[PDB]
Amino acid sequence: IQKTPQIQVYSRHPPENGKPNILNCYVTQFHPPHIEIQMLKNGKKIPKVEMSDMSFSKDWSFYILAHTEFTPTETDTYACRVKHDSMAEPKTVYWDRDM
Amino acid sequence: KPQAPELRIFPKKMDAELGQKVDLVCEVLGSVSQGCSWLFQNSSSKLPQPTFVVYMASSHNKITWDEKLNSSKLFSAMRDTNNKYVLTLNKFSKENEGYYFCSVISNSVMYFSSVVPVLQKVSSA
Amino acid sequence: KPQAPELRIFPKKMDAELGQKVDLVCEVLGSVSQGCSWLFQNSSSKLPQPTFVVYMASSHNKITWDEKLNSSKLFSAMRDTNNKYVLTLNKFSKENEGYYFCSVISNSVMYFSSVVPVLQKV
């Protein structure tokens, strides 16, 4: 009945420091639907973070995309702090250029 | 603890008259693994020795089978819509009786479907 | 049946009881470009139900264990000198009483070894 979330922190368009882009945070394979998705820049949470509406799959598991505008730097850190009941501790996944 | 495909077979059980076209479909859920392989565990055996039947790509219509005790005449398989891999048996003979089940490989880990009985229909009538 | 890919399994039967280390070596003879996989079936397995155990890449040194057996491993693995793959069980607790066999895929063809029942005699 329970399923553990699957996260991916990536950008819409190819990464390029200095150029404005969009950072996605695709969470999938989680049940129940109760999920908390935060997007942080250098530790601090980001303000305008739009979140796609929720929708599950034939395997009954849910998924949802969350993005927010950002401008890549070679020294700026980006991560997605996701909170979910099947997770003993709120997993914080970091953005990896090559992923 | 990443992704894990989901194999669904249909039907879960079956049996028939010596001589019928048995078609078994395998539905793979997930984009974490392409293609599909159909396995078989011969009914006649004490030790669970799986036997590779066939492999099908999720893209190309190219199928890779096994040239062993050339059974090319009783085995036939195609690929349908939504990750649907069909495996039909040409004439359910005695050499076909056994347990069938599909497998797939995602990020090096092998996943297996619940086995599906394909024995002779209660041998009655 | 030359250059044709095929695996050898040793030991071929183990009636060994609770307590023993057990090294199951797989000799892959042929041209397998992929790695070696270890599979078996025990308890909650009344029908032929194989469950992936470990995968050993041939090429580089990367090993992928079961999606769960990952924590509190009761199994061990390592690549032995020349075409060898050894799946060694730590303690023969009931948690691993079944039939084992390694598998190799060559050109999209699953090639299995021979099912070895490292069971008991009681």
Place this chain on the structure above:
Amino acid sequence: GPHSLRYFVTAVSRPGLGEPRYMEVGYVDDTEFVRFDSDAENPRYEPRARWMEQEGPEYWERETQKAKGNEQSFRVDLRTLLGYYNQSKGGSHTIQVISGCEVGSDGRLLRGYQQYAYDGCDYIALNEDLKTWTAADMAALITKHKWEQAGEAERLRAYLEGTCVEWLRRYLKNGNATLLRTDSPKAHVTHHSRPEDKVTLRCWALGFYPADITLTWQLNGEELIQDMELVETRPAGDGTFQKWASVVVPLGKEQYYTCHVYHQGLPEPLTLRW
């Protein structure tokens, strides 16, 4: 080609933080064209595809009513299920359900279905015979009977064979073209140094539609199914989709491998190499 209309509904209860949420989303060829979230500012049915905005106010009123009507009846179902399973009142539970029909390339009905799922696990479903039910446990057995001794399979079958295929055409008429659209993948491989003289090559594939795609690495004509490592096809966020499949290779001997990209939007599969 084949087409299919389906509806994914969700009625999740959650005591302690508001009433139960009810969402109703529909799909045409696996593409969301309609929705309804009880949590919305103005809870009502809304189009998800441009080609859906043609339908007038009369259409959206009928659907909103249906959702408003179902949303209520599903709230009881959550309570009804509390008793069938005898669970307390505090632990959120959730009931989901997928129901629709599949139409063959010829226009005929390939199959009609309906699957219920309580707390992620299967509950009850309409058989392929479109006349019988298949309960998963004893709780379903009650519903099964309740529906049998009521004439449910006939009414559901009537909708699966009537409403479903009929309106399937409707939407499909002004939405097929846009659904058949294709954006070829923008591929390329990446180089990554690794310990012990190896090297990992990542076959990228971005901005493609539809999401279906297959990337496979090969060596001397052999697909490296097990030596491979790919990711779940993730949405780029602009209608397009991304994905990548890598494989570890020995340094220097890096140009002996190639991943073949197979995608609907390609007349011929691509062959990338580092």
Place this chain on the structure above:
Amino acid sequence: RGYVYQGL
């Protein structure tokens, strides 16, 4: 189109 669900 949208279906009217039955009680469990």
